Amino acid sequence: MEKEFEQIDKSGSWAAIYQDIRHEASDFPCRVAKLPKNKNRNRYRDVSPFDHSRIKLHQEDNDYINASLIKMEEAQRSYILTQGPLPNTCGHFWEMVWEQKSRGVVMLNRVMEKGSLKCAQYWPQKEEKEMIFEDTNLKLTLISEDIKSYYTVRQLELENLTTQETREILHFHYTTWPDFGVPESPASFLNFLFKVRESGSLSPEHGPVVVHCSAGIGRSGTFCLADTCLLLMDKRKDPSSVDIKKVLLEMRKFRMGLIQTADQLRFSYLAVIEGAKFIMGDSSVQDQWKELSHED
Numbered sequence: 638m639e640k641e642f643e644q645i646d647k648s649g650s651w652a653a654i655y656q657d658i659r660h661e662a663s664d665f666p667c668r669v670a671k672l673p674k675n676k677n678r679n680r681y682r683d684v685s686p687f688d689h690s691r692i693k694l695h696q697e698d699n700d701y702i703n704a705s706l707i708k709m710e711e712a713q714r715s716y717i718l719t720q721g722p723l724p725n726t727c728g729h730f731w732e733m734v735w736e737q738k739s740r741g742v743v744m745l746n747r748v749m750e751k752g753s754l755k756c757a758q759y760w761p762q763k764e765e766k767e768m769i770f771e772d773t774n775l776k777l778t779l780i781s782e783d784i785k786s787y788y789t790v791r792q793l794e795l796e797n798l799t800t801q802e803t804r805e806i807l808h809f810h811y812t813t814w815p816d817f818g819v820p821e822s823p824a825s826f827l828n829f830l831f832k833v834r835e836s837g838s839l840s841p842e843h844g845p846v847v848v849h850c851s852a853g854i855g856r857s858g859t860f861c862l863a864d865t866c867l868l869l870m871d872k873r874k875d876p877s878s879v880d881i882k883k884v885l886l887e888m889r890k891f892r893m894g895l896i897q898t899a900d901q902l903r904f905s906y907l908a909v910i911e912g913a914k915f916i917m918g919d920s921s922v923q924d925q926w927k928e929l930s931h932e933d
């Protein structure tokens with residue numbers, strides 16, 4: 638993997654590889670996403686879910702939400718990639734989290750980046766100020782949070798008002814990954830990813846973990862691509878079979894535009910190559926990552 642990485646650098650073909658990937662990416666319809674009544678449910682006109690993999694709300698009125706089920710069959714894991722909820726779709730977002738039985742939500746953007754709204758405040762910032770979604774009859778309360786230097790983990794309690802039932806939702810919020818950019822290093826990224834893994838939110842006993850940035854394809858796609866590649870290196874009886882570009886192309890069958898820059902793909906490689914050390918058996922990399930991420 639680093640052999641090919643190595644050879645792309647000198648060749649200066651990171652952009653060429655990435656542009657080929659764009660050209661070879663699946664191109665399915667998004668007829669439901671482009672319906673006129675669903676226009677105010679899509680933050681970006683050019684980022685829609687394919688009709689075949691979109692998530693359907695269980696409400697008998699409008700079942701649309703800009704979100705896609707990415708089902709990696711060989712890796713044995715599923716992810717729900719969605720956009721940053723909009724002021725009017727926050728009820729939709731939690732309805733989906735509830736109906737799909739998700740246990741965790743991975744946020745990789747910030748509500749405001751470089752002076753621009755990229756996502757609505759869809760979770761309670763203060764314990765004493767819970768939120769109520771009346772269109773979906775749901776309640777959401779912040780129970781506790783763990784604030785690190787570049788990311789925060791929050792315990793939330795979503796409650797189905799109708800049935801009076803509640804569930805614990807773990808929110809993993811990466812707060813230092815810039816738009817159209819990359820994490821500060823593989824170390825920080827991996828430390829964060831394993832934090833989500835160690836929590837149980839990605840277990841097969843739960844519904845698809847929900848991942849998102851602003852548009853839900855760039856940072857979200859980088860996160861998911863790296864996680865899946867490492868899942869496969871650990872499965873296959875040989876981590877050298879894993880072709881990231883082939884894996885990316887497979888993921889783009891479920892959602893368009895996964896990985897938005899040539900540099901993000903190059904970070905992907907860097908993340909997987911580094912992550913590989915842990916899969917192999919190195920029982921010291923994880924802690925080094927944490928101590929290298931300066932999470933305090």
Ligand SMILES: O=C1C[C@@H](c2ccc(C[C@H](NS(=O)(=O)c3cccc(C(F)(F)F)c3)c3nc(-c4ccccc4)c[nH]3)cc2)S(=O)(=O)N1
Pocket residue numbers: 680681682683684746815816817818850851852853854855856857897
């Ligand atoms: O790393 C990232 C990039 C973010 C991202 C990715 C795509 C969009 C869709 C954005 N959609 S719009 O609706 O704001 C937009 C902007 C330009 C053209 C366009 C056509 F539909 F193609 F005409 C739509 C969009 N922005 C551009 C950029 C931005 C800067 C420099 C170059 C290109 C092109 N499309 C928004 C956020 S993410 O949160 O998914 N993670």
